[PDB]
Amino acid sequence: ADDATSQAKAAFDSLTAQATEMSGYAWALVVLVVGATVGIKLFKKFVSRAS
Amino acid sequence: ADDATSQAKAAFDSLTAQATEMSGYAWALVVLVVGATVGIKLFKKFVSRAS
Amino acid sequence: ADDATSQAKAAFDSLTAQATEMSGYAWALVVLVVGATVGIKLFKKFVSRAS
Amino acid sequence: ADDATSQAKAAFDSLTAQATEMSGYAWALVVLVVGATVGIKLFKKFVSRAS
Amino acid sequence: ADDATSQAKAAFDSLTAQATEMSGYAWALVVLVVGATVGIKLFKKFVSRAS
Amino acid sequence: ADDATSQAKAAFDSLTAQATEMSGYAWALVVLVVGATVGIKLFKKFVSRAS
Amino acid sequence: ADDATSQAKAAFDSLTAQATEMSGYAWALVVLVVGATVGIKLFKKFVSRAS
Amino acid sequence: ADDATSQAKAAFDSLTAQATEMSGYAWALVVLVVGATVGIKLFKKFVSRAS
Amino acid sequence: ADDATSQAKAAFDSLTAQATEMSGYAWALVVLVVGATVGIKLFKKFVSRAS
Amino acid sequence: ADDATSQAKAAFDSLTAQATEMSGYAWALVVLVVGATVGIKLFKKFVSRAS
Amino acid sequence: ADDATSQAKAAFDSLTAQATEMSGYAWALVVLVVGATVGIKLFKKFVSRAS
Amino acid sequence: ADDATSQAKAAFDSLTAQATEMSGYAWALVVLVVGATVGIKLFKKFVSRAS
Amino acid sequence: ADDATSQAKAAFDSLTAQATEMSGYAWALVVLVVGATVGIKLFKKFVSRAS
Amino acid sequence: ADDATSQAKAAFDSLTAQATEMSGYAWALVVLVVGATVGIKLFKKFVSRAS
Amino acid sequence: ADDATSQAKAAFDSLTAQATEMSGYAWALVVLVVGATVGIKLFKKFVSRAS
């Protein structure tokens, strides 16, 4: 049934938009972990600069 | 009956085209998960580059 | 389900705020290690100044 | 019988709402396992930051 | 059955509280491994400070 | 399916152009860290020149 | 059926050529990540050269 | 019938030779995926060598 | 089962006490490597003092 | 028959208590595999600590 | 059957004692790899001590 | 199949010769980085010679 | 059938000898990657020796 | 028939001894795969030791 | 099976003796790299002695 594939198609479009919403939180979580590594690694840069 | 196999043949062609439509959504869903892994893994590349 | 993505969204916001709380302790721990390197490296500066 | 399909339809709506209730507990259980991985993996981030 | 989903719901709440109890031991085990890395990595800091 | 490989090919070209955009920010971030090392290391050059 | 293995053979040749097309994009994506590591790591080489 | 087992025996020999033909394409498909992993993993080896 | 979580809890307490016993040997091993660096680096201090 | 469901009920209670006895051995077997991973992974921690 | 669970219980006790025998060889194999890392890493310590 | 191991053997010989071709570029890339360190480090030798 | 286990035994001996032939190529492939790391890492040794 | 269970019992003892003969080849096949992982992983240990 | 653990035990003893043979080559390879660092670093000692 091609009417059957219309029901499955609309639900797969809602599930892939759910994947872009959760993946958007994955870009923002690695935003805050990379903010920790840039701050901390500049602290170690000052360690070697005064050494 | 060979007329019987004509009815079964046309319905199996509609069901295999339904499999290419749903499989097209499977290529696009793994498009958005691989966009999450390329973005996030370049975030971890900047972590090691400043380290 | 889009109601399903509302439950996952609120729990991912609590987990990313948990990442900023623990990362705040990572800035303060590298605060105290960089205080050790600035103090000690000024001790070595006095070594070369009297030499 | 189309009256037969009315009895089957109402029981399949109760069974699919049962699937959203149990699946809601599956989002919350993976909420608490992902809270374990974000906490623990920030502990390993502090390991490499002091190293 | 909605009475069936009441039995499954209460057992899934006990299983998710079991996941928070075991995950609490995972935060404490990575507490003691991170205590090893902070102690040992301050030993290596004294190595470079006297060098 | 070769039509399937056309959908995957266009999304892999967008993901590799995303890798050149993020990698461009990695060249600019190491631009500013190398500006810190050239400035600071010329400060230490003046230390030895007056010594 | 050996005619059956002729249909399966031609479709497996199209699927393995699809694997060489996607794998060609994997060589080019690691081309651009290795261009980021050669550029950035020469930036760190200039850091140690002026130090 | 032992004449019956002669008809079944010859068709099972054609089906097992069909399994060696398709399995030959499985060795060649994992040939091209392992060519992707050897190329790409030598790209990551150059990443660490210049680091 | 909450009786199941009692068996898992007692074995995780024995495994975390095993982590403090092995980590105690990690503090003592870096004790003897830091004794090598303090002795040897005072040898290099006498090198520069007579120079 | 409701007397029939009394015979089936008592045998299903003995079979579910058999499932808790065998599952108790599954918690203890993963006790000894997790003791192997905590011991061995602290061995690798000493590898990186002396490095 | 509870006699059935007696046969399964004794065989699961022999299989978990087999897991402690093989895991004992895993502690000894990581004994010899950690002996390689302590020896070799003291060789690199002498490299930096004479430098 | 031993004919199966003949197909896998010839493709593993082509993949290991691919590893010697890419590794040859790794010797030449570290040729040009070591040319940078020998040139630059002789520049610093002239710094101390005129000092 | 014990005659059945004779047919399975001889084919499992040919499959395990196939595993030693492919594993022999795995020792030789890591031969050429370790030749890249010994050559390149002696290039970095000359970098620090002239520094 | 209890004479019927004597015929079934002797054939199940021959089938379980067939399972120990084939499982003996499974211990020896994972013997040769674990010999590949111990050899190759010591090759990677020498990679990090010279690095 | 305890006879099964006898086959696995003897193969794990051969694999751990293979780890001591390869690790013996790791002590000798770091023998020759430490001979390079002792020779070269005494060359730099003569540089400062005539300065």
UniProtKB/Swiss-Prot annotation, chains A, B, C, D, E, F, G, H, I, J, K, L, M, N, O:
Statement: the UniProt record of this protein carries the keyword Cell cycle: no
* Periplasmic side stretches: 1-22
User: In the UniProt record, which is one GO cellular component term?
Assistant: host cell membrane
The topology of this chain with respect to the membrane is:
Single-pass type I membrane protein
Q: Which residues cross the membrane?
A: 23-43
Q: Say if the entry is tagged with keyword Metal-binding.
A: no
Which parts of the chain does the record assign to the membrane side Cytoplasmic? Answer: 44-51
- Please state where this protein is localized: Virion; Host membrane
Taking the first listed entry, what is the main subcellular location of this protein, grouped into a coarse class? virion
Highest taxon in the source lineage: Viruses
Q: Which keywords describe this protein according to UniProt?
A: Capsid protein, Helical capsid protein, Host membrane, Membrane, Signal, Transmembrane, Transmembrane helix, Virion
Assembly and partners are described as: Homomultimerizes. There are several thousands of this protein in the phage capsid.
What does the record give as the function of this protein? Self assembles to form a helical capsid wrapping up the viral genomic DNA. The capsid displays a filamentous structure with a length of 760-1950 nm and a width of 6-8 nm. The virion assembly and budding take place at the host inner membrane.
Q: Which family does it belong to?
A: Belongs to the inovirus capsid protein family.
- What is the protein name given in its UniProt record? Capsid protein G8P
Q: Which source organism? A: Escherichia phage If1 (Bacteriophage If1)
Gene from which this protein is expressed: VIII
Of the intact sequence, the residues represented are 24 to 74 of 74
